[PDB]
Design a protein around this ligand. Structure first.
Ligand SMILES: O=C(C1CC1)N1CCC[C@@H](Nc2nccc(-n3c(-c4ccc5ccccc5c4)nc4ccc(O)cc43)n2)C1
Length: 351
């Protein structure tokens, strides 16, 4: 008797529970292959991610393992919640692939970013991102790699964050696909040490992109990225420098210097809906929030709690959403061989 069946979806073979029907490709990345399906048991649409041999290297394995643990711990409407996890393989020795199942969402945030969005929708997306991030922070999870390609939305403007970011302590992979680094905070770009509001920078980069319809800080690498940051925002204050490693400090203290543009210049009125007094006011509040999120120095950048209190955002504020109970192992960050990772991942899948 077989609980599973196989179909080719794109280049990949999906071996899934028979409950999951009519599989359609969504995409394939370096760390997962994704499809839409109908779930005949739940009578609803789902998304399924296949992790192929996630134990194949330390980078794949640490991420897969950590994400599986965290998914089972967190509990919040703006963060991925796992409907099901399974492997078609019957023992540890035969163990190859992991399938993760969640509610089917409608769009990636990249797609949403390209749309002309009203202030109601923009502020509501941002509010939800902040709730998701608050929830993670309350469990001691600091993301540090939030980006629109890992955020999904429904037609009713509801939002979910799909991943849990960088390894707290944290190498290499023979990948064809590059990592998107444009939404990373200065403290990540410059290896600085960080607190909760490292994630505010990324939210600011998303918000600014929603307005500008261009990636705020593009670059081939961190060098290019930092240049794009300083010319727009200017060279940080001496106090910021002191918190840099002597080697990065030399490099930063020595770049072609910049005063940086004001936020009205960075995001002109022509970019904002300003056809009604309501929209003119919202344009002003949006730029104020932006000016507080895109602050190079973390000591001067707004916190998650204060962003949630900002008038652009606070119209949505709800204690049940903002102040939900924290997620519930303590040794997460480790180093292992292929064979050790294989068993760690296998036992988590099997419970
Ligand atoms: O074109 C389609 C479908 C009609 C073919 N779309 C448009 C984009 C959103 C799709 N729905 C969806 N929902 C949830 C996650 C997800 N998803 C997932 C995904 C999917 C399933 C997951 C299950 C467990 C843990 C994480 C999971 C992550 N990865 C994605 C990467 C890129 C991406 O655009 C979406 C990703 N994607 C549906």
């Amino acid at each position: 008797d077989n609980q599973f069946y196989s179909v080719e979806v794109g280049d990949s073979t999906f071996t899934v529970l028979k409950r999951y029907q009519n599989l359609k490709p969504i995409g394939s990345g370096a760390q997962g292959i994704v499809c839409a399906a109908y779930d005949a048991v739940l009578d609803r649409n789902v998304a399924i991610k296949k992790l192929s041999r996630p134990f194949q290297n330390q980078t794949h394995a640490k991420r897969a393992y950590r994400e599986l643990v965290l998914m089972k711990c967190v509990n919040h409407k703006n963060i991925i919640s796992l409907l099901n996890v399974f492997t078609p393989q019957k023992t540890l020795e035969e163990f190859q692939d992991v399938y993760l199942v969640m509610e089917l969402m409608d769009a990636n945030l990249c797609q949403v970013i390209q749309m002309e969005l009203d202030h109601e929708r923009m502020s509501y997306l941002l509010y939800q991102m902040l709730c998701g991030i608050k929830h993670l922070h309350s469990a001691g999870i600091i993301h540090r790699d939030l980006k629109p390609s890992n955020i999904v939305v429904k037609s009713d403007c509801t939002l979910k964050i799909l991943d849990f970011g960088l390894a707290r302590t944290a190498s290499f992979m023979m990948t064809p696909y590059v990592v998107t680094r444009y939404y990373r905070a200065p403290e990540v770009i410059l290896g600085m040490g960080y607190k909760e509001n490292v994630d505010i920078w990324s939210v600011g980069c998303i918000m600014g992109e929603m307005v500008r319809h261009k990636i705020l800080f593009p670059g081939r690498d961190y060098i290019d990225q930092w240049n794009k940051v300083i010319e727009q925002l200017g060279t940080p204050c001496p106090e910021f420098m002191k918190k840099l490693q002597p080697t990065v400090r030399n490099y930063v203290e020595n770049r072609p210097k910049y005063a940086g543009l004001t936020f009205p210049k960075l995001f002109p009125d022509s970019l904002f809906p300003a056809d009604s007094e309501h929209n003119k006011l919202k344009a002003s509040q949006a730029r104020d929030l932006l000016s507080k999120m895109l602050v190079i120095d973390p000591a001067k950048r707004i916190s998650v709690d204060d962003a949630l209190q900002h008038p652009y955002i606070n119209v949505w504020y709800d204690p049940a959403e903002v102040e939900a109970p924290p997620p519930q192992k303590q040794l997460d960050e480790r180093e292992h061989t292929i064979e050790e990772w294989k068993e760690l991942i296998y036992k988590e899948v099997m419970n």
